[PDB]
Amino acid sequence: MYVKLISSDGHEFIVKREHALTSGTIKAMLSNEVNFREIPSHVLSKVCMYFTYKVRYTNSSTEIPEFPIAPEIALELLMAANFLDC
Amino acid sequence: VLRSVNSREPSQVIFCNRSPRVVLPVWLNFDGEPQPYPTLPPGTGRRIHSYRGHLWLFRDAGTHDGLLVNQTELFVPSLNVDGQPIFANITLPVYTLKERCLQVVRSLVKPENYRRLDIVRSLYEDLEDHPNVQKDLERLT
Amino acid sequence: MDVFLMIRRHKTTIFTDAKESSTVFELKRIVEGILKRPPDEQRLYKDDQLLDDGKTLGECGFTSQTARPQAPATVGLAFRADDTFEALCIEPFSSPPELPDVM
Ligand SMILES: CC(=O)N[C@H](C(=O)N1C[C@H](O)C[C@H]1C(=O)NCc1ccc(-c2scnc2C)cc1)C(C)(C)C
């Protein structure tokens, strides 16, 4: 079961519904495509990788790697994270 | 309230840093004051002498970001069974994406310039609200 | 062993995982479930290389330590419009702006 997250520049990211629901804001926008007028693809792609990361490593015994964020996207990703509450 | 108990009962412990951070161990003394101890580089360990009922937490030595120890915030040495030391596995938490973003921005922008950033006041306040051992100690209490 | 992937065509990107032991054709079934196009109307690629249905993802170089949750590996996808397959086309993501002076 999947949902579609669409960036400001029209990139369509298709992710597991349960991964998207990680975000309280997306849960709200779904209550199954969501458009993000302010989030470009180079940020939303990273947001999607975070879902996968969080779901994979939450309450896991195996050692946890650092979630990587390039300096050039950090400010925009901060803003999206704040909006999406995660 | 949160303080080590003065048990005087030895307990040997392995601090094992399974994080990519430089680790600052912090012992909470008998008055509840945080006492810093020597740091651990990434992937290193130290066999150390502590005591039963003592309280420890662990931070990024550079930024004071919170780390986990055996999957929780506080580590209390227990009785050594059959002479074996207690293992204290220090790891990264799964940070929220917001907290991770704040870490990276904090690492790139001097505090003098957080206000120069083009973001909502509340994000400026989140940046300025640095990970803080005192706040955490109050919270934990 | 789980591998974490982005299956990408034009401006479509599918985040999913699969087993290292699973096949290229089985990944086409996954895409079929999501985009409603049968395996015979799909080509999957690793960079410019056309992947063969019978091969495992691991054989095609998608391994658990390179196709990671926080940095998934990319699989290209091309559709057959009727008689012949379009060329492989993946729209790049947008460019981040210049770092502000204070960064
Ligand atoms: C009886 C008692 O409670 N003693 C205390 C004590 O010995 N403590 C408090 C903690 O339980 C740890 C222990 C102590 O200070 N052990 C010596 C020690 C020295 C270095 C280190 C570390 S931490 C990272 N690297 C090293 C070498 C750990 C322990 C003091 C002397 C501080 C009042």
Please check whether residues B21 and B77 belong to one and the same domain.
yes
Residues B29 and B51 in one domain: yes
Instruction: Decide: C74 and C60 in contact? Cβ < 8 Å.
Output: no
Residues C14 and C29: beta-carbon distance below 8 Å: no
Domain that holds residue C39: 1-103
Q: What is the CATH number of the domain that holds B46?
A: 2.60.40.780
Beta bridge partners of B48: B13
At C53, the amino acid letter reads D
Contacts of C96 in chain B (CB under 8 A): none
- Separation of alpha carbons B2 and B33, rounded Å: 9
- Residue keyed to tokens 């990434």: B42
DSSP-derived 3-state class of residue B19: coil
Q: How many domains, chain B?
A: 2
Say how far apart CA B67 and CA B141 lie, in whole Å: 18
Considering only the beta carbons, identify the residue of A67, A69, A82 that sits closest to B123.
Answer: A82
Inter-chain touch A19–C15, beta carbons under 8 Å: yes
Choose the closest CB to A78 out of B71, B93, B98.
B98
**Total number of domains constituting chain C:** 1
Tell me the chain A residues in contact with residue B101 when contact means C-beta distances shorter than 8 Å. Answer: 69, 74, 77-78, 81
Q: Is the same domain home to B97 and B87?
A: no
Place of tokens 């091969």: C55
The data reach a resolution, in angstroms, of 2.1
CATH 3.30.710.10 fits A1-85, yes or no: yes
**One-letter identity of residue B79:** L
Name the experiment that determined this structure.
Answer: X-ray
Are residues B64 and B26 part of one domain? yes
- Of the candidates B56, B74, B91, which is a domain's last residue? B91
| Amino acid sitting at position B106 | R
The domain that holds B121 is classified in CATH as 1.10.750.10
Task: Provide CB contacts within 8 A for A30, sequence distance 6+.
Answer: A3, A20, A21
Which residues, including other chains, have CB under 8 Å from residue B138's CB and lie 6 or more apart? Answer: none
Domain around B108: 92-141
Same domain, B98 and B70: no
For residues B86 and B100, state if they share a domain.
no
Cα–Cα distance for residue pair A75/A79, rounded to 1 Å: 7
Residues B44 and B22 in one domain: yes
Helices A74-84 & A41-57, crossing angle to 10 degrees? 60
Residues flanking ligand 1, CB < 6 Å? B 6, 8, 15, 25, 27, 37-38, 40, 46, 48-51, 54
Q: Check CB contact under 8 Å for B116 and C103.
A: no
What's the gap in Å between B27 CA and the centre of ligand 1? 8
Residue C72: which CATH number? 3.10.20.90
**DSSP 3-state percent helix, strand, coil across chain B (nearest 5):** 25, 30, 45
Q: Any residues with CB less than 8 A from the CB of A53 and at least 6 apart, and which?
A: A67, B94, C69, C70
Query: Same structural domain for residues B58 and B126?
Result: no
- DSSP track, C40-54: GGEEEEETTEEPPTT
B78 and B124 belong to one structural domain:
no
Spatial separation of the C-alpha atoms in residues A24 and A34, rounded to whole Å: 13
Beta-bridged to residue B47, according to DSSP, are: B14
With an 8 Å Cβ cutoff, are C102 and B113 in contact? yes
